[PDB]
Design a protein around this ligand. Structure first.
Ligand SMILES: [Cl-]
Length: 534
C-alpha cells in the first residue's frame, strides 16, 4: 500500500547540505564538467560498494557506533575514528546553518539586503545593474557575503574582531539544537513528507527560473562538458572521492546505525543502491540549479564563468540568494528557501548530535553516570562546540572554516577511513564470508562487482588517490587568493591526524595489552564476537 513512506525515509536520510552547498562549491572549484567524471567513477567503484558494505554490516551486526566492529575487535578503533569525524562535523557543519539563519533573519524585509548598493557594508565598486576597472566591480550579492555576513579579513593570520550579528545567530542555532536534542523530538516521524519534499519542490521552482535566464545555457554547458586537461590533477580526485564519502556519510558511522535499525532480512542491497542514486541525483539537481544561475551571472557581468562567483564555500550563499532576486516576490522566496536550508541543516545536526552523544555516553563507565547525564552531556557538548565555533564567527572566520572543511571530516581522512574499512571487511574478516553472510541475510547473492570492489578496486583507488596527492602536494588555497601558510596546513594535518590516528593507535594498544607472541595475539584479537542472533 503505502510503499511511498519507505521512499520518503530514504530521502529523509539522503538529501542534506552536502548536496545543496558542498557539491556545487566543489564542482565550481575544480571546474564543472571535469569534476563529474571522477564523481561518477568513484560513486560506482568506491561510493556504492562502501555504502552497501556499511549498511549490510550494520544490519548483520544489529549494532551501531563502535560495537559494529566486533566482527574484528582489533580494528574497533575505526569506530572511534568515526566518532571523531562526526564530532568535527558538528563543530563546523552548524556554521553553515548560522550563515543561513542570518540570511533568513535578513530575508523578512520590504527589499532584500543583497539587491541594493546603497547600504553601509558595500564598497565603492558596488554596481546594482551591470553594463558594457571593469573587473574590480562586484555584484551586491558578493558585497553582502564578504562584507556583512563574513566581514572577511586579509587572511588566516588576521582573525580580527568577533562578528556579533553572526554570533547571535550561531548561539540561537546551538540553543535550538540543544532544546530539540534534549527534548528528543520525533523529527520526521509522520510529517516526513514535507521535510522530504520541501527541498525538491523549492529546488524545482529554482531550476525553472534558472532555465528562463539568458546565458544559463552557457552555465549548464560549463557544468556538463568537461575539460580533459584537468583530469591529470589529483585535486579533482580528492574532491570527488571525498565528496562522495561525505554526502553518503561514509566513515561517519551513520550508515552503520541505519543498517542496525533495519530488520535482519531486509534487502540492504536495494536500499543501498536506492539511497546512493537518490543522493547523487539530488547533488546533480542542485548542480543544475546553481550553475544555471552562475551562467546567468557570467553573462550579466561579462566575465568568465570560472571567475564570476566565489570558489569558497559561499556559493550556496552567492548562487542561491542571487536567484531569489529574480523571483516574482523576492522576500517570500528568500524566506522559503532559507527556511528549507535551515530545516535540512537542523535535521542533519540533530541526528549527528544524537549519535555522537549516545555513543560517547555508551563508552563512558557507569561510575561517570551523572544524574541528568543526557541533559548535562548535551549541554556540555553544545557549549564546547560553540566555544570552538567562536573561531569561525570572527572576521578571519571563513579561512578557519575552510581548514575545518578540507582537512577535517574530508580529504585524506575519509580516504583513510574507507580504505581501512574495506581492508578490514574484505581481507582480515574475509570478503567471501561477508558475501555469504549477506546472501544468507537478504536471500539473493549480490553481484560479484561488490566483492571485487571491496577486495581490490576500492582500496587501491583510495590508496592511489592518497599517494598521488602526497607525492604531488599543492597547498590549500581559498578562492584562488589566499595561499595558506605552513601553520594553517599544519593545523589541518593536526585535525586529519587526530581523526586518522585512532585505528593504528587502537591496534597497537590492543596488541600491547594482550599476551603471548604476536601471532596468537593477532589470531585472538581478530576473532569476531557474535551477537545473540548469530
Ligand atoms: Cl553527492
Amino acid at each position: 500500500t503505502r510503499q511511498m513512506d519507505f521512499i520518503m525515509s530514504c530521502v529523509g536520510f539522503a538529501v542534506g547540505l552536502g548536496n545543496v552547498w558542498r557539491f556545487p562549491y566543489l564542482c565550481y572549484k575544480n571546474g564543472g564538467g571535469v569534476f563529474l567524471i571522477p564523481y561518477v567513477l568513484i560513486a560506482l567503484v568506491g561510493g556504492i560498494p562502501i555504502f552497501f558494505l556499511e549498511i549490510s554490516l550494520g544490519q548483520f551486526m544489529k549494532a551501531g557506533s563502535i560495537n559494529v566492529w566486533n566482527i574484528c575487535p582489533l580494528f574497533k578503533g575505526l569506530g572511534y575514528a568515526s566518532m571523531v569525524i562526526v564530532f568535527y562535523c558538528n563543530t563546523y557543519y552548524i556554521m553553515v546553518l548560522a550563515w543561513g539563519f542570518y540570511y533568513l533573519v535578513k530575508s523578512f524585509t520590504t527589499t532584500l539586503p543583497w539587491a541594493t548598493c546603497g547600504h553601509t557594508w558595500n564598497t565603492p565598486d558596488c554596481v546594482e545593474i551591470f553594463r558594457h576597472q571593469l573587473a574590480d566591480r562586484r555584484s551586491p550579492v558578493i558585497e553582502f557575503w564578504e562584507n556583512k555576513v563574513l566581514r572577511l579579513s586579509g587572511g588566516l593570520e588576521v582573525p580580527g574582531a568577533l562578528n556579533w550579528e553572526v554570533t547571535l545567530c550561531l548561539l540561537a542555532c546551538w540553543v535550538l539544537v540543544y532544546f530539540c536534542v534534549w527534548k528528543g523530538v520525533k523529527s520526521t516521524g509522520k510529517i516526513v513528507y514535507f521535510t522530504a519534499t520541501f527541498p525538491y519542490v523549492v529546488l524545482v521552482v529554482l531550476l525553472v527560473r534558472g532555465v528562463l535566464l539568458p546565458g544559463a545555457l552557457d552555465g549548464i554547458i560549463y557544468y556538463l562538458k568537461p575539460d580533459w586537461s584537468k583530469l591529470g590533477s589529483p585535486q579533482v580526485w580528492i574532491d570527488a572521492g571525498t565528496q562522495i564519502f561525505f554526502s553518503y556519510a561514509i566513515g561517519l558511522g551513520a550508515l552503520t546505525a541505519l543498517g542496525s535499525y533495519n530488520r535482519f532480512n531486509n534487502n540492504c542491497y536495494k536500499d543501498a543502491i536506492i539511497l546512493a542514486l537518490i543522493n547523487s541525483g539530488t547533488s546533480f539537481f542542485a548542480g543544475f540549479v546553481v550553475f544555471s544561475i552562475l551562467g546567468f551571472m557570467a553573462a550579466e557581468q561579462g566575465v568568465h564563468i570560472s571567475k564570476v562567483a566565489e570558489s569558497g564555500p559561499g556559493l550556496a550563499f552567492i548562487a542561491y540568494p542571487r536567484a531569489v532576486t529574480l523571483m516574482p516576490v523576492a522576500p517570500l522566496w528568500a524566506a522559503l528557501f532559507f527556511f528549507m536550508l535551515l530545516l535540512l541543516g537542523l535535521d542533519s545536526q540533530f541526528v549527528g548530535v544524537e549519535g555522537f552523544i549516545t555513543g560517547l555516553l555508551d563508552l563512558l563507565p557507569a561510575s561517570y553516570y551523572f544524574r541528568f547525564q543526557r541533559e548535562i552531556s548535551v549541554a556540555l557538548c553544545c557549549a564546547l562546540c560553540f566555544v570552538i565555533d567562536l573561531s569561525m564567527v570572527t572576521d578571519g572566520g571563513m579561512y578557519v572554516f575552510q581548514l575545518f572543511d578540507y582537512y577535517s571530516a574530508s580529504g585524506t581522512t575519509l580516504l583513510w577511513q574507507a580504505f581501512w574499512e574495506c581492508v578490514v571487511v574484505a581481507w582480515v574478516y574475509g570478503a567471501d564470508r561477508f558475501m555469504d553472510d549477506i546472501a544468507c541475510m537478504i536471500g539473493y547473492r549480490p553481484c560479484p562487482w561488490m566483492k571485487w570492489c571491496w577486495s581490490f578496486f576500492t582500496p587501491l583507488v583510495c590508496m592511489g588517490i592518497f599517494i598521488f596527492n602526497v607525492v604531488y602536494y599543492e597547498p590549500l588555497v581559498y578562492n584562488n587568493t589566499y595561499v595558506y601558510p605552513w601553520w594553517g596546513e599544519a593545523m589541518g594535518w593536526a585535525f586529519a591526524l587526530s581523526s586518522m590516528l585512532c585505528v593504528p593507535l587502537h591496534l597497537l594498544g590492543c596488541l600491547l595489552r594482550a599476551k603471548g607472541t604476536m601471532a596468537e595475539r593477532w589470531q585472538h584479537l581478530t576473532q569476531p564476537i557474535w551477537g545473540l542472533h548469530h
